[model samples]
Target: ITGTSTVGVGRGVLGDQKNINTTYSTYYYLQDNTRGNGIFTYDAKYRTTLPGSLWADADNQFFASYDAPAVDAHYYAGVTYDYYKNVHNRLSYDGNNAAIRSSVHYSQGYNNAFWNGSQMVYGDGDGQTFIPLSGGIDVVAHELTHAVTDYTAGLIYQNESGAINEAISDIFGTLVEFYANKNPDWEIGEDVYTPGISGDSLRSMSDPAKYGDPDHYSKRYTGTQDNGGVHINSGIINKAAYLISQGGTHYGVSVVGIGRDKLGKIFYRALTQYLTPTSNFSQLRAAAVQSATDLYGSTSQEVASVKQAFDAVGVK
Candidate 1:
């Protein structure tokens, strides 16, 4: 929609007040023109249909309970966009300013969110399980990072490659969470998962086994479920990534912490330059090592830590 760019006040699913970018013609719409081409959010209206209706408001104020999901989805998409542009120097998910779009309230009590290859869709979970998924910044970023992965590595979403794809999303999702400075932690979907429970998340990067995920390659799941255990086996790579940044001893293997910034740079470089559609755990280790060598040096501590992290996870 064409109109003058405007700002609107809204309360997110977490009940935090914030300003959102809007477009005004005859009414205010959730089309943010300030980001790339734009960040458009829509209302799914508890249906399975796609990007449903572009969220419109009679007044620029969005405080209704029903508006919370859209508020968070639109706002968080902007934050994720800013993270890529400022931190990675990438314009958007495609490295060219692609318009970001999302839909909230996707279905009745649907407890999931995903990127549908073209745009994002968030479900309003059953009250007992989850609230609006877009409320979680990490969730939003995780979904958006899939777009980034598709455009760059194009990693196949199956078996080891699928796990690698999942871990990449988790890694960048955690990085974006830290970038936004919103109660940053190495947890995924803590804010929007299980509103009735506290101090729990969908997964843990620091300790993947905290939720029964394998932290070592030898313990990896070889089942065919979940696209060859994409979510289940991601723990191995996630643990390696955590060790690369924060450093830890696992199974008698120790890694020296290289901090977060370098961790991000090495992984981003590997994702964009080295990783392929069929790269497996051993190949991922090679890519990360090469990536660290490219950014730091062949004999640099960063490269050594990358090697140690993968060794700690038994990748090779």
Candidate 2:
């Protein structure tokens, strides 16, 4: 179906006016047919389930009521698509120019967002903890990066591999935040995590230990809950990534800063080329080191910084 490019004006959950990408066909639809199948946003209508209907408007103006989430979701999906295509030369999550879809307003008092092995799902939140999950660009990127990993390493969603999967999402999510230059920080879900609390986030990459998450292997959770502490143990790898990009000291070990661009190159190379479904922390350390060496030479500061960051986190 042929479509024409149109600009959609909407106020996000935070009451910020942002222009969104949309297309006009027989009906002015909330579809961005420029990327892949283009980014499409749907309304779950507060049902604890899947997509409902494609959000439609009379004139592509989507900011009067509950359409705020749809606006941010569609807009953020475009941002994430641009990030991967421009930064990693990837066409889409599957490297096949797949159409990205998102469903918002899922469930009553829903307070989370995720990639359900297919499309992105977001919740409007309970209003106590969050406003709308799609309002956060990093959160959107974080979920979509899960799709990227599924297509790439397909890391198992358990134990260390699962934690690696989570950490990779966080890493690239932060990178996407930086790419968009939207008040970027190393905090995950900060923009939409807690509406009542300011200057707080769901997770912290620069200081995962601040939220009782392990920043060193010595403190990793051994419990079977949370898929063998997938979210908890991910803090260790997240700390290493943060240290590699920004430099830091943890548990008596120090890492030299390599900056974000080199960090992205090294990590992206390792993720797309060297990692496997069951790669453990030590294996990932080796992969990242090799990736840095390949990109910046064996004796380059990038390689040294990666090795030091992993060491700082007790990966080996």
Error of 2 at 162 (Å): 0.2
Clashes of 2: 0
Task: Return the TM-score for each candidate structure.
Answer: 0.99, 0.97
Clashes of each: 0, 0
Off by over 4 Å in 2: none
Candidate 2 residue 38 C-alpha distance from true site, Å:
1.2
**Residue 148 lDDT in model 1?**
97
Give the runs in model 1 whose Cα sits over 4 Å from its true position: none
Q: Candidate 1: lDDT over CA atoms? A: 0.95
Error of 2 at 265 (Å): 0.8
Best by TM-score: 1
Displacement of the residue 70 alpha carbon in candidate 2, Å: 0.6
Q: What does candidate 1's lDDT look like per residue over 1-316, in tens digits?
A: 9999999999999999999999999999999999889999999999999989999999999999999999999999999999999989999899999999999999899999999999999999998789999999999999999999999999999999999999999999999999999799998999999999989998999999999999999999999899999998999999999999999898999999999899999999999999999999999999999999988889999999999999998888
Please give the CA lDDT of all the candidate structures.
Answer: 0.95, 0.90
